[PDB]
Design a binder for this molecule. Structure first.
Ligand SMILES: CN1CNS(=O)(=O)c2ccc(CCc3ccc4c(c3)N(C)CNS4(=O)=O)cc21
Ligand SMILES: N[C@@H](CCC(=O)O)C(=O)O
Ligand SMILES: N[C@@H](CCC(=O)O)C(=O)O
Ligand SMILES: [Cl-]
Ligand SMILES: [Cl-]
Ligand SMILES: [Cl-]
Ligand SMILES: [Cl-]
Ligand SMILES: [Cl-]
Lengths: 263, 260
């Protein structure tokens, strides 16, 4: 049928999608800026569609409830037909690939540790062997699922602690995890993706840092409902943008050119 | 019912075992991709036969004839059912074959003989005393051929017309050329292979500078193959179980050939 505006689900996660200054008097896609806003424009141009950016209503990436089997977050928006495509830092995972399609990755990441500067922690093993410093993850995302499913001794030990810690060590948004690191005097460390960690390390007041190696290696992909006719063109567009150097330039633009912690 | 796997002799992905002359079939070979093939086949429920690509190439399309060679060609022309190899995901290949999600990350990188006064691709481009080149019929050569980045296009203009040829038939021949050229040849190759060689005797090469791009290897199937979906889920399962990282640690294991 006739071309229709593509509904893009995304999430307010800096620097991927952020409210522009003066957003209160802007409308539509002009309200937003960031890496995924720029990426959406490039994908749409290469694939020949018009689109509307829509922030996921529940503010979540996406997890399946173990009891009801209902998917929430951006994954749910695709599964239940509320959006046509997700352009966001959405991690490629097995359980998600069983229900939605992903392009080839547009960005690499691994799970990593964020500390308040000076915290005496260098690794996941360090965290797992002590109790003074609490630690947790984002809710409803791939990092929490990683720990829940891991059979690796250190990560299983970490999960066994996190799942029963009181008060809860889990946070609803990345910003809440950052705040908890910044306000806890070295007594909370946050497990989050290396991309987000490296972004925050360049934001004022420059009081956090990434420590240790990454715990895994994976990527973000552009997601579509299973069988969607958009998937093929989106995939080729991701590969073209990578090969032309545009994805690397976009990361530099939003992470480092705009950094607030020096050159 | 036996799946024909095309692969390539490239250390440490696929290597001939010691005493392979008295072995047969899949038991002749060892390495990262041999172990990976066994894991993929177990998860997908197929029997398979490893076969070394007949022309020894990864795969490129002839500009005049438009015929594909290498492992890509074996998939395109129906000579193999799947490629399990360090085969780079690229746009031109994704137009003719299918790739799983990546099983390993890499980028193009620079190999020098230790002590060579080169720190970056920009350094190479701004001089002519030290020659440099790439593997033929692979994704690194195509990267330079297609690139519009000023530094890389300048490098391509030099490499394509340099005499004698700066291109090599196999990775091992590029490494040998670095080792034998007294610092007058640098080799552009994928970071995975570079890092493997840097930890092998005689410990006379090193990786310099950052990677020039970021990409991955995928398991490839002919377009529309029924195996693609299961293979893709298998790669993700193996990654999430930690087995891909374990295999990398096994086959890049440093036994101290170089230093402590
Ligand atoms: C950025 N980019 C451009 N597109 S691409 O050429 O397809 C490509 C392939 C691989 C990677 C390296 C990072 C990664 C991403 C995703 C996964 C991984 C590993 N592994 C190692 C396991 N499987 S995965 O799909 O979760 C990046 C990449
Ligand atoms: N990128 C993750 C969210 C962040 C996290 O879990 O650390 C996801 O897609 O679920
Ligand atoms: N992995 C490459 C071969 C090595 C190279 O080109 O440096 C390919 O798939 O073509
Ligand atoms: Cl419309
Ligand atoms: Cl032998
Ligand atoms: Cl298993
Ligand atoms: Cl078999
Ligand atoms: Cl440029």
């Amino acid at each position: 049928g006739a071309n229709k505006t593509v509904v893009v689900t995304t999430i307010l996660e800096s620097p991927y999608v952020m409210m522009k200054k003066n957003h209160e008097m802007l409308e539509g896609n002009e309200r937003y800026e960031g890496y995924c806003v720029d990426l959406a424009a490039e994908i749409a141009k290469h694939c020949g569609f018009k689109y509307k950016l829509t922030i996921v209503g529940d503010g979540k990436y996406g997890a399946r409830d173990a009891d009801t089997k209902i998917w929430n977050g951006m994954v749910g928006e695709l599964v239940y037909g509320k959006a046509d495509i997700a352009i966001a830092p959405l991690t490629i995972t097995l359980v998600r690939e069983e229900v939605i399609d992903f392009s080839k990755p547009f960005m690499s990441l691994g799970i990593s540790i964020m500390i308040k500067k000076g915290t005496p922690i260098e690794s996941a093993e360090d965290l797992s062997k002590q109790t003074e410093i609490a630690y947790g993850t984002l809710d409803s995302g791939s990092t929490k699922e990683f720990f829940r499913r891991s059979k690796i001794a250190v990560f299983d030990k970490m999960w066994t602690y996190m799942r029963s810690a009181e008060p809860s060590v889990f946070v609803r948004t990345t910003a809440e995890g950052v705040a908890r690191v910044r306000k806890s005097k070295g007594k909370y460390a946050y497990l989050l993706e290396s991309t987000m960690n490296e972004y925050i390390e360049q934001r004022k007041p420059c009081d956090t840092m990434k420590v240790g190696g990454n715990l895994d290696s994976k990527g973000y992909g552009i997601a579509t409902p299973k069988g969607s006719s958009l998937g093929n063109a989106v995939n080729l567009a991701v590969l073209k943008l990578n090969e032309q150097g545009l994805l690397d330039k976009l990361k530099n633009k939003w992470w480092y050119d705009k950094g607030e912690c020096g050159s």
